Amino acid sequence: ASRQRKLEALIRDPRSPINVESLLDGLNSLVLDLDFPALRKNKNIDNFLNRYEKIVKKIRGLQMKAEDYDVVKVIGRGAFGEVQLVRHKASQKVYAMKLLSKFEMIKRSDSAFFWEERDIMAFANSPWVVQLFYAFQDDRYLYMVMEYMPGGDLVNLMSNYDVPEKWAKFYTAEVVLALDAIHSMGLIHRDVKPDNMLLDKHGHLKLADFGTCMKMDETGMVHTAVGTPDYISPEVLKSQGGDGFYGRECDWWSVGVFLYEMLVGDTPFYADSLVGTYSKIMDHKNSLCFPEDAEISKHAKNLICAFLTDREVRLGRNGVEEIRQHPFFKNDQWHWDNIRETAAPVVPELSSDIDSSNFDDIEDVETFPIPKAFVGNQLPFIGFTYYR
Amino acid sequence: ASRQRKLEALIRDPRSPINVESLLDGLNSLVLDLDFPALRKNKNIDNFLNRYEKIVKKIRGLQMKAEDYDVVKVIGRGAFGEVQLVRHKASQKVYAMKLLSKFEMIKRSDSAFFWEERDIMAFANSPWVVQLFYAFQDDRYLYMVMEYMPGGDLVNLMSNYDVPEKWAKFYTAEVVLALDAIHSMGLIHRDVKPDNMLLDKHGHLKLADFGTCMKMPDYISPEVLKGFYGRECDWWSVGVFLYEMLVGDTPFYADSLVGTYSKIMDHKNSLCFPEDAEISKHAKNLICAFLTDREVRLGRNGVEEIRQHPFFKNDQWHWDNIRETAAPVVPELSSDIDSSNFDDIVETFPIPKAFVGNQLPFIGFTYYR
Ligand SMILES: COc1cccc([C@@H](C)NC(=O)c2ccc(-c3ccnc(F)c3)nc2)c1
Ligand SMILES: COc1cccc([C@@H](C)NC(=O)c2ccc(-c3ccnc(F)c3)nc2)c1
């Protein structure tokens, strides 16, 4: 039949919401939401659960789960969970596994952010994005098994090394190509910073933490929770108070803040309080001054000022090409088409497959209540499971 | 990787409860049970339905449905629905489609019977069972698309024809082989009768109506008229069937129902063959062999003792080739929608306040051959 080929095409497609893994999540979520002593007083619910008792226990055994991975060490912490350095028990392969608590996401009213984060890492097929091999879930958490990045974040690098300009040219250029890939996918990052810039086994850049990512409207804009204030742009610091819009330019601001921090040493709009940091970002024409002691070229000064302006005249409105032709980026080391295949400034010297010397030691769990009626706490997480 | 091959094996298997069609039923049922104005006041339910709004409307369009079939005529009626003679709009192929109301099955507390009925017709792969090509559903009904049997039931045949013994030998033997196939599958029919015995385009037998089937009042046996009971209760009804064709009336007939029940319990005394009736000694012997107490009945120790009974001897057919020989009454049918051998023959669920789950018993019913 002509309709049956169209139906089988939808189920085979991994982007589709009615794939085999998503359909299995629907069944697991339905049984998890229904299987309680109170809800089994309903005749329809009791007879359904008894039919699907044995097969759901079988599928839970066969499907991927937290018990398949040994937790080596906690390597990062966030709002709704943590990032664990893990080893798969069967294959002995090392991964970085991000956890996200379902209770905390439901409680704090933020349970849509992970969809774009899963899709960016799973489906970008880009060397600038951290690849997602497996996504899975249980009653408590969502899991995202990713390629481990043993070189560590760019906060680690700036603390340990006094960064010269040739190194800054490299890492900025990689950030430019990384954001261009995200902008090409139809997305604004909203939270570009050294914490979200990770270094691989070879010392080359990939981006992680795509929680603040939102898909652009048809114009190239987006219309509500924010990152750290040091790297946030002034147009974002007005839109948060009542409606407001902003485009890809807000990411390019943060590249200017990033390029300032490596060369100078401190953040350009730094203050003791948070209110001071916000005020300096709004007054960026007057407050942006380069320290006289600081070792910075004229071209790098020019590029930071080109990024750190009002949105309407900023560098990166009219494509990436104007950023790429800027004289700062000229060198006799790499070109734009081959930067990721050249030798990195800092190649990590790693002692083992579970070496986390480039990550700092992380310092050290309420569940859902057993409900009276149907609440549907697992329904927002149907479709999350993914197998490469 | 070893677990993923086992998981994909379960989903590919059409007998399995977690196949692709059953998983799609789970999604459709979840959306049907949840999509109401009251339940959308829950944030989790509203955001789930908005994600799966467009794709569920798309799958409902692509999947099989009642609108794909033109209803020619209603050919039977039952407790929870009807049997429609139908034609598929695309292919122009004629089928018999059984409807079953979801409201009536939920209300009267009987919503497990259809599983064995679907599985018997879908998966028997036997010439004695009516084949199920497609099973599907909507919010209101379950549907079972079957091969049309234009020869009609054996009630039709006994009314129209005065049935001789050579004809009775044939139709009884086909019933014996038909029940043997059902008994081989691990099932007791519980309701063997002329209404449930249909004749195909060639005048050969298939069984329909497998509602009373479970896995191991004119026609009901005395052991059922109280406990537990085996395959022997079907073999009683073959004796009642063989009596009705040769004699003309039911052996334990009464005016009231209470009279019919009493005569079945007193079957040693009440079973008398009319003196006017044209019946052999061997056919008398076989009816009496079937119409006894369960403990000494014909058909306890396999079908072989029934097959070797002298009544069934003839110079027409053998047991291995009976269904390939010429039938007694071959139907003379004028068209693919001829229903001359069939006689001429709606409250919904309330919009609920909370989650009730009225579609949950019907998850897994959809089947595509
Ligand atoms: C809002 O809920 C959250 C819960 C947990 C964490 C976070 C944020 C703060 N962290 C990340 O997104 C994040 C994700 C991957 C990695 C990573 C990737 C590859 N190799 C590594 F070695 C580490 N690092 C950091 C947020
Ligand atoms: C449970 O509620 C019910 C709802 C409707 C009906 C019935 C029972 C009484 N009828 C049947 O089962 C039944 C009878 C004949 C045919 C059939 C099969 C093939 N070719 C035909 F021409 C007719 N198919 C099915 C019960």
Q: Are A55 and B358 an interchain contact pair (Cβ–Cβ within 8 Å)?
A: no
- Give the number of whichever ligand sits closest to the CA of residue B118: 2
Neighbours of B200 (CB within 10 A): 18
Q: How far apart are CA A319 and CA A317, in angstroms?
A: 6
- Residue in B292, B299, B219, B283 with CA at minimum distance from that of residue B251: B219
Q: Provide, as residue numbers in chain B, all residues whose Cβ is less than 8 Å from the Cβ of A45.
A: 357, 360
Half-sphere exposure of B344 (CA within 13 A, CB side): 0
Q: Provide, as residue numbers in chain B, all residues whose Cβ is less than 8 Å from the Cβ of A382.
A: 48
- Which residues, including other chains, have CB under 8 Å from residue B20's CB and lie 6 or more apart? A11, A20, A23, B11
Q: Please give the distance of CA A241 from its chain centroid, rounded to a whole number.
A: 25
- Using an 8 Å Cβ cutoff, are B239 and B264 in contact? no
User: What secondary structure does DSSP assign to B13-30, as a single string?
Assistant: -TTSTTSHHHHHHHHHHH
Q: Is B18 on the interface with A (CB under 8 A)?
A: yes
Q: Which of A7, A51, A112 sits opposite B62 (nearest CB)?
A: A7
Q: How far apart are CA A34 and CA A39, in angstroms?
A: 6
Half-sphere exposure of B353 (CA within 13 A, CB side): 1
Neighbours of B296 (CB within 10 A): 9
Provide the residue count of chain B: 369
Q: Which residue has the tokens 């991964």?
A: A95
Neighbours of B5 (CB within 10 A): 9
Q: Which residue has the tokens 């079908």?
A: B303
- Using an 8 Å Cβ cutoff, are B187 and B214 in contact? yes
B207 CB near ligand 2 (under 6 Å):
no
- Using an 8 Å Cβ cutoff, are A51 and B115 in contact? no
Q: Is B102 on the interface with A (CB under 8 A)?
A: no
- Using an 8 Å Cβ cutoff, are A243 and A233 in contact? no
DSSP state of A129: B
Q: How far apart are CA B367 and CA A295, in angstroms?
A: 74
Q: HEC states along A258-295?
A: HHHHHHHCCCCCCCCCHHHHHHHHHCHHHHCCCCCCCC
Q: Which residue has the tokens 């995202």?
A: A144
Q: How far apart are CA B86 and CA B335, in angstroms?
A: 13
> How many helices (DSSP H) and strands (DSSP E) are in chain A?
14, 13
Note the helical H segments in A17-131.
20-34, 43-51, 53-62, 102-107, 113-123
- Token output for A344: 């990195």
- Residue in B142, B129, B125 with CA at minimum distance from that of residue B206: B129
- Residue in A321, A232, A327 with CA at minimum distance from that of residue A279: A232
Between the CA of residue B9 and those of A197, B3, B15, B234, what are the distances in Å?
42, 10, 11, 37
What angle is formed at CA A140 by the lines to CA A134 and CA A144, rounded to 5 degrees? 20
Hey, which residues does B129 pair with through a beta bridge? B207
The amino acid at B334: S
Contacts 24+ apart (CB under 8 A), B122-128: B122/B367, B122/B369, B123/B15, B124/B181, B124/B185, B126/B181, B127/B204, B127/B206, B127/B323, B128/B174, B128/B177, B128/B178, B128/B181, B128/B182, B128/B205, B128/B206, B128/B207, B128/B323
DSSP state of A359: S
- Token output for B320: 């291995």
Q: How far apart are CA B59 and CA A7, in angstroms?
A: 7
Backbone angles phi, psi at B162, to 5 degrees: -80, 110
- Token output for B339: 């229903």
Backbone angles phi, psi at A50, to 5 degrees: -70, -35
Q: How far apart are CA A271 and CA A238, in angstroms?
A: 19
Minimum distance, in Å, between the CA of residue B52 and any CA atom of chain A: 8
CB pairs under 8 A between A and B: 103
What ligand 2 atom has the least distance to the C-alpha of B148?
20
- Using an 8 Å Cβ cutoff, are A336 and A175 in contact? no
Q: Which H or E run contains A215?
A: strand A214-215
- Residue in A233, A39, A210 with CA at minimum distance from that of residue A132: A210
Backbone angles phi, psi at B38, to 5 degrees: -70, -50
DSSP state of B300: S
The amino acid at B296: V
Q: Please give the distance of CA B308 from its chain centroid, rounded to a whole number.
A: 29
| End-to-end CA gap in chain A | 30
Helix (H, G, I), strand (E, B) or coil at A120: helix
Q: Which residue has the tokens 């990939």?
A: A206
- Which residues, including other chains, have CB under 8 Å from residue B166's CB and lie 6 or more apart? B314, B316, B328
- Token output for B144: 């079972």
Q: Are A20 and B11 an interchain contact pair (Cβ–Cβ within 8 Å)?
A: yes
> How many helices (DSSP H) and strands (DSSP E) are in chain B?
13, 11
Burial class (CB in 10 A: 0-12, 13-18, 19+), A272: exposed
In our burial notation (b when 16+ CB lie closer than 10 A, e otherwise), range A223-253 reads eeeebebbbbbbbbbebeeeeeebbbbbbbb
- Using an 8 Å Cβ cutoff, are A130 and A207 in contact? yes
Q: How far apart are CA A93 and CA A87, in angstroms?
A: 6
Between the CA of residue A228 and those of A267, A278, B194, what are the distances in Å?
12, 11, 80
- Using an 8 Å Cβ cutoff, are A136 and A63 in contact? yes
Hey, which residues does A97 pair with through a beta bridge? A84, A145
CATH number of residue A165's parent domain:
1.10.510.10
Backbone angles phi, psi at A109, to 5 degrees: 65, 45
Between the CA of residue B83 and those of A17, B147, B157, B251, B295, what are the distances in Å?
36, 12, 19, 30, 38
Q: How far apart are CA A100 and CA A366, in angstroms?
A: 13
Between the CA of residue A287 and those of A228, A259, A265, what are the distances in Å?
19, 17, 17
- Using an 8 Å Cβ cutoff, are B138 and B66 in contact? yes
Helix (H, G, I), strand (E, B) or coil at B272: coil
User: What secondary structure does DSSP assign to B164-197, as a single string?
Assistant: -HHHHHHHHHHHHHHHHHHHHTTEE-S---GGGE
Strand extents, DSSP E, A79-153:
82-88, 94-101, 132-137, 141-146, 152-153
Pairing type for strands B141-146 and A386-387 reads unpaired
Q: Which residue has the tokens 């039952």?
A: B78
Q: How far apart are CA B326 and CA B314, in angstroms?
A: 14
- Using an 8 Å Cβ cutoff, are B361 and A48 in contact? yes
Relative orientation angle of helices A165-184 and A249-264, to the nearest 10 degrees: 160
- Using an 8 Å Cβ cutoff, are B40 and B49 in contact? yes
DSSP state of A341: G
Q: How far apart are CA A10 and CA B61, in angstroms?
A: 13
Helix (H, G, I), strand (E, B) or coil at B129: strand
Q: How far apart are CA B4 and CA B2, in angstroms?
A: 6
Instruction: Provide the annotated active-site residues of A.
Output: 191
Q: Which H or E run contains A172?
A: helix A165-184
- Using an 8 Å Cβ cutoff, are B253 and B277 in contact? no
Q: Which residue has the tokens 């005529």?
A: B73
- Which residues, including other chains, have CB under 8 Å from residue A71's CB and lie 6 or more apart? A84, A85, A86
**Torsional sign, CA A62, A68, A74, A76:** negative
Q: Are B18 and A42 an interchain contact pair (Cβ–Cβ within 8 Å)?
A: no
Distance A186 CA to ligand 1 centre (A): 22
B112 CB near ligand 2 (under 6 Å):
no
Residue to substitute from A21, A42, A44, A133, interface B, most B β-carbons within 10 A: A44
Taking every pair of C-alpha atoms in chain B, what is the biggest distance, in angstroms? 78
The amino acid at A327: P
Q: How far apart are CA A45 and CA A127, in angstroms?
A: 48
Hey, which residues does B188 pair with through a beta bridge? B214
Between the CA of residue B261 and those of B233, B265, B335, what are the distances in Å?
15, 6, 43
Q: Which residue has the tokens 């992970």?
A: A114
- Using an 8 Å Cβ cutoff, are A291 and A270 in contact? no
Between the CA of residue A59 and those of A13, A18, B114, B225, what are the distances in Å?
21, 18, 26, 44
Distance B78 CA to ligand 2 centre (A): 7
- Using an 8 Å Cβ cutoff, are A233 and A191 in contact? no
- Give the number of whichever ligand sits closest to the CA of residue B83: 2
Relative orientation angle of helices A20-34 and A53-62, to the nearest 10 degrees: 130
The amino acid at A150: P
B79 CB near ligand 2 (under 6 Å):
yes
Q: Which residue has the tokens 């890809």?
A: A248
Q: HEC states along B313-341?
A: CCCCCCCCCHHHCCCCCCCCCCCCCCCCC
Residue to substitute from A4, A13, A27, A381, interface B, most B β-carbons within 10 A: A27
Q: How far apart are CA B239 and CA B253, in angstroms?
A: 14
- Using an 8 Å Cβ cutoff, are A352 and A201 in contact? no
Domain that holds residue A226: 152-341
Q: How far apart are CA B61 and CA B90, in angstroms?
A: 15
Helix (H, G, I), strand (E, B) or coil at B73: strand
What angle is formed at CA B327 by the lines to CA B322 and CA B333, rounded to 5 degrees? 140
Q: What is chain A's Cα-based Rg?
A: 23
Minimum distance, in Å, between the CA of residue A208 and any CA atom of chain B: 26
Q: Are A382 and B48 an interchain contact pair (Cβ–Cβ within 8 Å)?
A: yes
DSSP state of A336: T
Residue to substitute from A60, A62, A108, interface B, most B β-carbons within 10 A: A62
A207 CB near ligand 1 (under 6 Å):
no
The amino acid at A26: G
